[PDB]
Design a protein around this ligand. Structure first.
Ligand SMILES: OC[C@H]1O[C@@](CO)(O[C@H]2O[C@H](CO)[C@@H](O)[C@H](O)[C@H]2O)[C@@H](O)[C@@H]1O
Ligand SMILES: [Ca+2]
Ligand SMILES: [Ca+2]
Ligand SMILES: [Ca+2]
Ligand SMILES: [Ca+2]
Ligand SMILES: [Ca+2]
Ligand SMILES: [Ca+2]
Ligand SMILES: [Ca+2]
Length: 186
C-alpha cells in the first residue's frame, strides 16, 4: 500500500485501457498516451489471453470481445477511437529459477518483471509469435509485473505465455498465480 486508497485484492493484474485518435507506432507512443490522461476504462486482467479480432480494438465492442472472460469487469464501455491499448500491473507468483516468455501479438508490447524488460516488441506488426530470451528470478514469491500492449488498427491479439522448463511447456498468466496487490488472493 502506498496511499490513502484501499486497493482491490483479486487474482489478476490491474488493467487500464487507453484509446486515442493519434497513431501508435511504438512503445514510447503508448506510454505517452498512458501518461497523458486517466484511463478510458479499468478492468481486472485475470486471464491474459486476448483476441484475436479484426476491425480495430478501439472501435465498437471490439475491446469487450478482445478481453473476453475479463470484459465483465470493465468500469465503462469506451467510446470509439482509432488506436488503443492496455496497461496491466500487479504481481505474479514465481519460484526462483529461469523463465522465458513466448508472446503472440498484433501490434507491439513490453513486459517487465521487477522493473526489468523481459519481452519487448517496439513496433507495429501483423500477428507474430516471438520466443524471448530467458531471465532469472532470484527469490520465490510474488514478483512485480507490468505489461503494455497496443493496436494501431486492423487486427489485434495479445497472448504472452511463460515457460518455467526451458521452453518445453508454456502457460497463460491467469488467476492461479496473479495478484493485484501482492497479497494472496482467496
Ligand atoms: O502492413 C501494414 C498493412 O497491413 C495491414 C493489413 O490489414 O495491417 C496489418 O499490419 C499492421 C501493422 O503494420 C497491423 O497493425 C494490422 O493489425 C495488420 O492487419 C494494413 O492496415 C496495412 O496495409
Ligand atoms: Ca492504494
Ligand atoms: Ca494515466
Ligand atoms: Ca466501445
Ligand atoms: Ca477470449
Ligand atoms: Ca468474466
Ligand atoms: Ca492508427
Ligand atoms: Ca493491429
Amino acid at each position: 500500500q502506498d496511499d490513502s486508497t484501499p486497493d482491490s485484492l483479486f487474482a489478476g493484474l490491474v488493467g487500464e485501457y487507453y484509446g486515442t485518435n493519434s497513431q501508435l507506432n511504438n512503445i514510447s507512443d503508448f506510454r505517452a498516451l498512458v501518461d497523458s490522461k486517466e484511463a478510458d476504462a479499468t478492468f481486472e486482467a485475470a486471464n491474459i489471453s486476448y483476441g484475436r479480432g479484426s476491425s480495430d480494438v478501439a472501435k465498437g465492442t471490439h475491446l469487450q470481445e478482445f478481453l473476453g472472460s475479463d470484459a465483465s469487469t470493465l468500469s465503462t464501455d469506451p467510446g470509439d477511437n482509432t488506436d488503443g491499448g492496455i496497461y496491466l500491473q500487479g504481481y505474479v507468483y514465481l519460484e526462483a529459477g529461469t523463465y522465458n516468455f513466448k508472446v503472440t501479438a498484433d501490434d507491439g508490447y513490453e513486459i517487465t518483471i521487477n522493473g526489468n524488460p523481459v519481452a519487448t516488441v517496439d513496433n507495429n506488426q501483423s500477428v507474430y509469435t516471438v520466443t524471448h530470451a530467458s531471465f532469472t528470478i532470484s527469490e520465490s514469491g510474488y514478483q512485480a509485473i507490468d505489461m503494455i500492449w497496443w493496436d494501431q488498427g486492423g487486427d489485434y491479439v495479445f497472448q504472452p505465455t511463460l515457460s518455467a522448463d526451458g521452453g518445453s511447456t508454456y502457460f497463460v498468466l491467469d488467476s492461479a498465480i496473479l495478484s493485484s496487490t501482492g497479497e494472496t488472493p482467496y
